C-alpha cells in the first residue's frame, strides 16, 4: 500500500561502504566472525565445490572459450583464493572497498604469480558492466543484498551480456525463512526470500537450472542457497 516502505528502500550505498571500509580485511572480517576457527569457510567451500561439480555438465565451454570467471562482491578474494581458482582458467574480481582490494593483492599473490588474475574492478556491482561475451561464470556471493530489487534486476541483465555462449551466473546468498525481505542497518543491505529471488531472476530474463541449500552452517545464521542461472533463449 501507499503507507508501506519496502525493505530495499532503506539501502544506501554510502552507508554500506562506510560499514565495510571499517571491517577487518580478513576472513573473520568478511564472514562477520565466522572465520577459520569455525566450520563456515570449510563448509562454504565444500558446498560451492559440490555445486560446481553438479553443474559440470551444464558448464561446458563453447565456441573455443576457456573458463574465465568473475568473483562479484569479492571482499579480500576469499572465494577466489580458496574455491574458484581450482575451477577457472582466469578470474576477474569486482569489489568496491579499498582496504579489501589492497588485501586482495596479498591474499591472491600465488594466483597472481600464475597470471590467473585478470582485472580487479574497484567499483560497486551497480556501476559495473562486464565486457560482452567474456565470462564462463559470474559468481555472486554474499553481496547482492547491497542492491535494491530494481538495481539487482538491471545488474543481472548486464551480466547476461557478459556471458560467453553457455555461460552461467551463480548467486550464493542468504534467504529469509519467510516471504518477507529483511533490511539490515548494519551493512545497509537486504536479505531476500527465495520467492523474491525467483521473481528477480525471472524479471532479469534468467532461467533457474539449479537451487541447492548450503549445508552444515551454524543454526543461528540465515539459510544459504546456491542458485545457478542461464539466460532464457530467444
Ligand atoms: N554495491 C556493492 N557491490 C559489490 N560488492 C559490494 C557492494 N557493497 C558491498 N559489497 C561487498 O560485499 C562483500 C560482502 S562480504 C563477502 C565477500 C566475499 N563474497 C566472500 O564470500 O568472502 C564485501 O566485500 C563488501 O564490500
Amino acid at each position: 500500500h501507499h503507507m508501506d516502505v519496502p525493505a530495499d528502500s532503506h539501502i544506501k550505498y554510502e552507508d554500506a561502504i562506510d560499514y565495510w571500509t571499517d571491517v577487518d580485511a580478513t576472513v573473520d572480517g568478511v564472514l562477520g566472525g565466522y572465520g577459520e576457527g569455525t566450520v563456515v569457510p570449510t563448509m562454504d567451500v565444500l558446498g560451492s565445490n559440490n555445486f560446481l561439480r553438479k553443474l559440470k555438465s551444464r558448464m561446458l565451454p563453447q565456441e573455443n572459450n576457456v573458463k574465465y570467471a568473475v568473483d562479484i562482491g569479492a571482499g579480500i578474494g576469499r572465494v577466489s583464493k580458496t574455491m574458484l581458482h581450482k575451477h577457472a582458467a582466469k578470474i576477474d574480481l569486482v569489489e568496491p572497498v579499498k582496504p579489501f582490494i589492497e588485501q586482495m593483492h596479498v591474499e591472491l599473490a600465488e594466483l597472481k604469480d600464475k597470471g590467473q588474475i585478470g582485472q580487479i574492478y574497484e567499483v560497486g556491482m551497480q556501476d559495473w558492466t562486464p565486457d560482452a561475451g567474456k565470462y564462463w561464470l559470474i559468481w555472486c556471493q554474499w553481496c547482492v543484498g547491497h542492491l535494491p530489487d530494481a538495481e539487482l534486476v538491471a545488474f543481472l541483465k548486464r551480466c547476461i551480456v557478459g556471458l560467453q555462449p553457455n555461460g552461467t551466473i551463480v548467486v550464493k546468498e542468504n534467504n529469509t525463512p519467510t516471504d518477507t525481505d529483511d533490511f539490515d542497518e548494519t551493512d545497509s543491505s537486504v536479505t531476500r526470500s527465495d520467492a523474491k529471488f525467483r521473481q528477480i531472476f525471472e524479471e532479469a530474463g534468467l532461467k533457474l537450472i539449479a537451487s541447492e541449500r548450503q549445508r552444515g552452517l551454524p543454526r543461528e545464521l540465515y539459510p544459504v542457497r546456491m542458485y545457478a542461472l542461464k539466460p532464457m533463449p530467444n
Side-chain angles (χ1 to χ4, degrees), residues 182-202:
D182 294 340
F183 175 71
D184 190 352
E185 295 149 42
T186 300
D187 56 7
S188 206
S189 74
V190 292
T191 306
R192 290 172 170 102
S193 70
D194 183 70
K196 173 61 67 69
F197 273 122
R198 286 174 179 260
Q199 177 203 130
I200 285 173
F201 299 154
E202 179 175 297

Side-chain angles (χ1 to χ4, degrees), residues 13 16-17 20 30-31 44 71-79 94-97 100 123-126 141-143 146-147:
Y13 293 140
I17 300 303
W20 289 108
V30 298
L31 301 188
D44 176 63
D71 182 353
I72 303 293
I76 64 174
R78 180 193 68 89
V79 179
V94 175
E95 170 54 47
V97 170
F100 290 173
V123 66
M125 76 180 85
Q126 67 274 18
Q141 176 159 355
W142 275 326
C143 61
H146 293 106
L147 272 57

Side-chain angles (χ1 to χ4, degrees), residues 157-169:
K157 289 179 179 173
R158 295 196 308 281
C159 283
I160 291 170
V161 176
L163 292 175
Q164 292 175 7
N166 205 37
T168 307
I169 299 162

Side-chain angles (χ1 to χ4, degrees), residues 121-228:
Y121 298 103
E122 311 181 17
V123 66
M125 76 180 85
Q126 67 274 18
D127 295 317
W128 179 75
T129 301
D131 297 335
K134 184 176 187 178
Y135 296 112
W136 165 78
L137 171 61
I138 299 178
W139 184 278
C140 308
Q141 176 159 355
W142 275 326
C143 61
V144 306
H146 293 106
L147 272 57
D149 294 350
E151 287 83 345
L152 179 55
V153 170
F155 164 78
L156 291 169
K157 289 179 179 173
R158 295 196 308 281
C159 283
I160 291 170
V161 176
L163 292 175
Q164 292 175 7
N166 205 37
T168 307
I169 299 162
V170 169
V171 173
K172 182 167 191 183
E173 293 288 350
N174 299 334
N175 283 175
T176 54
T178 64
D179 280 19
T180 70
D181 296 352
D182 294 340
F183 175 71
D184 190 352
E185 295 149 42
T186 300
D187 56 7
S188 206
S189 74
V190 292
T191 306
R192 290 172 170 102
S193 70
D194 183 70
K196 173 61 67 69
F197 273 122
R198 286 174 179 260
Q199 177 203 130
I200 285 173
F201 299 154
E202 179 175 297
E203 291 187 15
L206 290 169
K207 179 147 61 180
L208 193 60
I209 65 161
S211 176
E212 297 296 330
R213 176 86 174 258
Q214 171 63 53
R215 299 171 192 177
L217 300 182
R219 303 227 301 171
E220 65 270 19
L221 301 189
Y222 281 120
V224 172
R225 188 154 294 280
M226 290 170 284
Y227 300 110

